[model samples]
Target: AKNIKKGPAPFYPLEDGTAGEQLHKAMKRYALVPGTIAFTDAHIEVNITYAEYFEMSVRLAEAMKRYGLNTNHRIVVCSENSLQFFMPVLGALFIGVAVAPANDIYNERELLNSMNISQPTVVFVSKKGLQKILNVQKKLPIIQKIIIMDSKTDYQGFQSMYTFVTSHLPPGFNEYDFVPESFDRDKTIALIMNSSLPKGVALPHRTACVRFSHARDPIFGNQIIPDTAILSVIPFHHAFGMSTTLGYLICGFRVVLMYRFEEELFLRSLQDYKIQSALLVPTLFSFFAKSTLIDKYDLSNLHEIASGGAPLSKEVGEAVAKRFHLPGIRQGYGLTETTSAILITPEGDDKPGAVGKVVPFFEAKVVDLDTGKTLGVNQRGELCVRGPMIMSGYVNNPEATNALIDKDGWLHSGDIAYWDEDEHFFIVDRLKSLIKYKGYQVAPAELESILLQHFDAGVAGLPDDDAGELPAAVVVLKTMTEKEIVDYVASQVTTAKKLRGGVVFVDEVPKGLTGKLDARKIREILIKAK
Candidate 1:
């Protein structure tokens, strides 16, 4: 620990470099080191060295250039977690194209919304994802090419990603231009993601670079070990998944990729790979705390577990620590708007239920929601933050952008939180109506807006043990069963947005004296539902 330096400054080399530039340097530095090891399916594993990883990215970038994708063009990926899904995203980013990832499990409507918002010129889709995209492909006029990851099966105007990349290779690849374009980091939008905003949030290269810098810093006696592995089970569409995995890659850690999260597969991957650390939501950690499946495998190699994307209770956090015999589970806090966590529990810090101190390159304050006055320690208010890691703004939506980020550059996170005397923050409640289910944001407004098409309805969230919140709907319907309404809503949205808390039938929705819809009254009715 004596070799570790203490400071708020970035300890790593993170100044005025694009993510692609920094990645190139790290790849060259650790080219001989083991890189990504991906589990495709049962009994199938694909491993690549950092050198091979860089080569593939260069070839892919070359293919992109040949296909007419230029700097600042948008490329979208809607696929499951695989090397096929992973490599092309970085390839696009390296060539100065903005990457927008959509949830692989997104239904047709949800997928269409994302596709429409991103307006990508090239899209990479898994087989199942392609099926949904084809249904709405005509609506996306800007999509010039659709590359399928899983299928050799021919669809009109769609080619296999393998064929597309391999066929475009120039003769004598060693002489190919591997040097990426130099650009202004602040002006170049590298990533686009949907936060609470349905449109999308644009993240510049600086934001991503700063986040990676912080993750690589050896502060509070914490730093990623070279050549060690961490399980990559979280979906890449998520900010937590996107940032942490890339951070590990840039810091020379081997990322053990899983297609998705399954309890057995997650445990087996940890045991099989001798994984050192993992990032998981509170729900998964709860399973780790209670499940009898622990006795079946050896996971003693795990050194740390990072909990975020939703709140973790003190009881559950302590239980997991006791079960695993670790010092403490490191918890952190951030929103999609912040790109990833700006506050992380330092290694060996034992503040139960606190999300830890703010990380470097960021400043936070708790301000009173009504008066806009900054609050002191333990005084509850909305958590406001300003940092290099914050997103540039909501894409093409100035009203939403202005509502979130103030004139002073403070991004108002609509979460009611209070920091302790030591600057460790604790979230009390959400001032926003968004519901967090297993770390995925389920915007009640989105669900309520959809519900209004069929019934006079109101939606609210209820507390759940497994998921942080379960969406509950109060509807005035003609003769629909609870299951029927729930099923309809589930069909229209993504899996996380489904009304898992069940729906309650109400006689009439309460309105204010002005006949405006009263959301609070509807929330009360849903809360008391049997």
Candidate 2:
């Protein structure tokens, strides 16, 4: 017993708690320092300290309570990453309300479906997203009230969140009014991240807390440094945006939130803010690696550039690192089902093309797709995982929930991958039909459905170098031109889902022996056509 040695000290303290509990702890730790810095271009920037953030959250929470919102009440926030976006979301979280953050770029139909599924009692929207919500407002009966994030917007039946929070707070509201201890940590659902597959993945308190704790491990090195300024251009609707930004705040890091990612604006903000780190996608990394506009900026302070959501190539990673004079681009892999990241490439382990090892508390395996037999090292197969951070289930979609999370609790990641002898994992391909366009998940079915409305078509993802994949349509058309088809699909879907690969006119879609769409046969046609 005496001879047995212990492993290295735990990277950081492990805690099984709720988002509210973590928020309480963060407020106490960094009460004086500014935690969130939200910016829109160079003109508008709002900085708030942890104490102020806590106070405002409390005020908004009290206001929500006065309005009869209680635990588990679904509150939806549809906005870009802004100060206005987070205040209400966090405020609602303080009161144990489940937040379903929908992508602001979603079209009217897409937005309507998401709202119908989440069935929120109240919705918070940005000025830009107001029209989309208004287009489908009559269909959303469960939505009792609409709160605008922007102050200038004056629409009928809509109240600005600023006015609502300031006016509706109880007369005797104080710091002692809220009790974190009284809240049930495990039962509280914090965020419901909307998936492109048209399902709301319900992430409970334990899920967020586990990911937050795992973030503090020393394996990430300077990537999670406290008090360091980091640029956050990713939209809050995605798990990568919410988890990483919130985790940074919890660790006392200053997050510079971008309203949207415009090329010039993003570069200007980085130089102006002197940001030390950033969490970007592969497309942005491509811009950094190849864009001539990057040469004009003095971006020396930028050290850590972490890429996620989409796969980053070894060529792009090395190019960006060399061009920026940084160590290397840190990459991670996860899905909406697994929260954000279950596997992350650590600082020291610079394995090219590898996503990284399974995060400290998560377990992963690769199984043969045909036999369901677990594979050994370097054997490529479907990747599966089980972790505390994994979401409970997809809201309102039991079939999809069951399909993803097996009886053994392992969530089958529809991704083809392999593990090395050193525990490193490399994602080689995707078994799923989701097209990752610049890190945005564009479901082939979603695009296909839209395409079918206009023409006899079958949509598929075409391999792309810069973007992970581009949504391509192969259609059996009568008189419509390729330009007409592309424009029709582009006008209906979001910016990311536009038919970038263009339309291919085929006599008929390839069919297998069982009368199913044969993807391999279709690929052959596309290759020949190319």
Candidate 3:
């Protein structure tokens, strides 16, 4: 209790109950707002209104009810970004039915693993994803329905969402007639997106009540300009993107989404749409900071740029902020276990690199790795957070959940971070990601940041007989040799931290699906190069 850090007092009163009812209430208010547009396809140039969003979602909810869905059942939504893809997710929420979103780009077996984990009653997929779902159909019998998310009528044999809705939802179905269901928010499961590859984090219905409470207030609401557009290329399946999509709809901003990241399309859309506020990943931010291609477009309209989903270095964050001459890069932090970013860089304080203070309702502490005692400010250690917004558990994997969240209910975030006197949090690196080079404890992130000055880089610990593990780097280079790569990094760090294992040049550094540097994969590729 001596060293505990409490979040700023909540701006809005805690709704503190089931998620659906609270979200439904918010939807009611949002639907009544000047209903011009809710979503826009940045690449395709299609848009939908709030009225249409409300109409589609409620009708889909009614159709789901007709199909015998309830709180007990769940649905799996595996599709790329589409307005139709969002309808099933919203509809399921309306009826208190849990929704599990999967990547449409996953391999067939990857699809099998995710589907088997949730075991949904229906799988809403796009045309590209349906074939993979069909491939793994026999393994999971729980999927009673396969609804296509496409607007087209012809699907091999399965029902398209268009016809399914047409059949169950009667003509002239009034949006006013629909009633959103209520449930035990703390007990009932809301959404289960993966915390990583196999384990799915089960968020309770109460999460929305807490998460939205922080968003609903004008204190957080007015951060974005009124009547502006938000450009999004982040995948909707991920927690950050999902929250952004759902959260933006409740506000006055127009959301422009992309099918996937294409540099030309992203900048042009940002330019043409007059995007004022956007929630971007670090990869895009890096490009904005250094890439010459951005000069092709007019991004003067860009006012607010917030980034999370992966660790963004202070050097890069500051560079992007200075290059754009914007207010500052609002670097934030979040995890799958915590529905949304519990640690957000709030507006008033402009600490460029620091991922700001604990958000409302959250309590966080940095504990020493060896002693497990709460550390004072500026003492780096494991960051553990506890709050109502934290996920209930990893779906069906109690051992993993037990390992992640302790008996005291504090979820131990594997990230190593510390807070300053100003209370701004700065992330260091993964707690377990230290490269043990003859017991010196080398950090790859620090090395990778320096290598980024020359080229995109990934650093990892390579197995060695003499040192237990040695530092290695995988980078994208043109004319630079392996010695040049090693010396450049060696000049900056101690002997133990130098790239002794070697450097492997590649076309482009492979990153995680969410844009994190895949250091493990980079190490494997480095091993293969030998």
Best by TM-score: 3
lDDT of 2 by residue, 1-530 (tens): 12111122336656745787777667556765554432222337657666766776767777888888888589899987776667777777777888999888888998998988888999989888888888898998888888887673455657787678766776777864475534775677888887663888898888887767756666743435555777877777788888887777667777777765677777877787788887787656646655677778989888778888765657667877887777787887878888878888876887878888777667788888889888888887789888777888888788988988888778888888888767788876566655678877665545655664443456677887789777787777647788888898778987888988857888877742112355556555655666
In order, what lDDT does every prediction score? 0.74, 0.74, 0.80
lDDT for each residue of candidate 1 in 1-530, tens digit (9 for 90 to 100): 22111226665646568887777666666765544432223225667667776777777777897888877599888887766666777787777888898877777887888878888998888876877878878999998888887665555557786678777877667613477666778888888887632668789888888877777876632375654777766677878788887777777777777765677877788788887887777656647656677668888998888887766656667877877667788877888799888878876655987888777777888887679988876887788888888888888888888999998788998887788766678876566666788887665546766775554666777777788788888877646687888898889988888998868877876642112345577667777764
- The residue pairs that clash in candidate 3, if any, are none
Among all windows of 10 consecutive residues in model 1, the one with the lowest summed lDDT is 1-10
Measure candidate 1: CA RMSD: 10.3
TM-score of each: 0.79, 0.79, 0.95
Order the candidate numbers by lDDT, best to worst.
3, 1, 2
Instruction: Show model 1 residue runs off by greater than 4 Å.
Output: 1-7, 34-43, 151-157, 175-177, 220-224, 433-530
Stronger candidate by lDDT (2 vs 3): 3
Q: In model 2, which runs have C-alpha deviations exceeding 4 angstroms?
A: 1-10, 33-43, 152-157, 221-226, 432-530
Return the number of clashes found in candidate 1.
0
Return the lDDT, model 1, position 96: 82
lDDT of 3 by residue, 388-488 (tens): 88889988889998998987789999989898887778888786677889878787778888888765777888888889888898888647788987988
- For model 1, what is the alpha-carbon lDDT of residue 388? 81
